């Protein structure tokens, strides 16, 4: 499902990603233009998927998750999108 593409895309222009843990439909994102949502249970199933890949930097507190992508995740996330200037975080400041 393409939902899973834009969540990927949604790291760019955002960078660090914040999700409260529920077992229920919730989403914080898709934001600059559309700002519409997706269920978290399925978000969580996507992060673990390639989280076994080094791409991502875990954090956790309380009920919230905090995802930042490692450089290897920047580069992959670029090329999976096929569009690759580089992640927003290093593009300007």
């Amino acid at each position: 499902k393409p939902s899973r593409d834009n969540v990927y895309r949604f790291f760019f222009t955002e960078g660090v990603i914040a999700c409260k843990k529920d077992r229920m439909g919730t989403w914080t994102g898709t934001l600059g233009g559309n700002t519409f949502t997706v269920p978290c249970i399925q978000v969580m199933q996507l992060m673990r998927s390639l989280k076994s890949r080094n791409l991502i930097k875990e954090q956790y507190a309380w009920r919230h998750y905090y995802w930042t992508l490692n450089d290897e995740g920047i580069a992959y996330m670029r090329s999976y999108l096929h569009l690759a200037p580089s992640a927003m975080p290093n593009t300007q400041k």
Binding site: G15, W62, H64, Y66, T68, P89, N90, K93
Partner: protein
């Protein structure tokens, strides 16, 4: 306005718990905070401040845009700062991350703490206590306390001079806990003229 203080309490409780997770080896000594108008900036107190800024903006902005994304502020109302904590010694919470690191580094315990004991007591601190409990020297439920200088444990006056931290070190085979108390060189911090039992007489 009861619950508008509680929402900040629950808020402030969230920032502190979160940074501790992710500001480490980077000497996280705490947070101060206030806001007025469209600025949520949240200064950060820290010891090792070039890993919080980063090579290219990353760590401070990587921690910026999640707090807009956690607490939902519309993008740009946050800032961030970092404040060099003068005399790295005198802040315990900076020096538990010293212990944690040092014990991960496989050091034996007495050598580990007793150094920090000097560094803090060197830094101007008026005292210390360092206590490592855990499975050290296994099968024992053995605890150890390492003392310096001098200190006050009773009354509520201590909470002014005593700023301490209790944080776990997760070893193999079990846990090893770590606790550091320290002092404030009564001088410039607080200074309320502060340990009661010292009266002065101007002559």
């Amino acid at each position: 306005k009861k619950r508008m203080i509680v929402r900040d309490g629950v808020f402030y409780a969230e920032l502190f718990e979160f940074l501790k997770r992710e500001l480490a080896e980077e000497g996280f000594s705490g947070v101060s905070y206030h806001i007025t108008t469209l600025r949520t900036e949240i200064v950060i107190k820290a010891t090792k401040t070039r890993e919080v800024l980063g090579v290219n903006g990353r760590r401070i902005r990587e921690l910026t845009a999640c707090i807009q994304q956690r607490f939902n502020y519309k993008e740009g109302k946050l800032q961030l700062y970092v404040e060099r904590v003068e005399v790295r010694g005198l802040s315990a919470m900076a020096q538990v991350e010293s212990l944690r690191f040092k014990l991960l580094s496989n050091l034996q315990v007495r050598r580990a703490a007793m150094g920090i004991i000097r560094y803090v007591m060197e830094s101007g601190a008026k005292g210390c206590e360092v206590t490592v409990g855990g499975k050290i020297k296994g099968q024992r439920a053995k605890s150890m306390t390492f003392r310096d200088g001098y200190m006050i444990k009773s009354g509520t006056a201590h909470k002014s001079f005593v700023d301490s931290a209790c944080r776990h070190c997760y070893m193999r085979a079990g846990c090893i806990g770590v606790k550091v108390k320290i002092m404030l060189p009564s001088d410039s911090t607080g200074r309320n003229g502060p340990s009661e039992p010292l009266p002065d007489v101007i002559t």
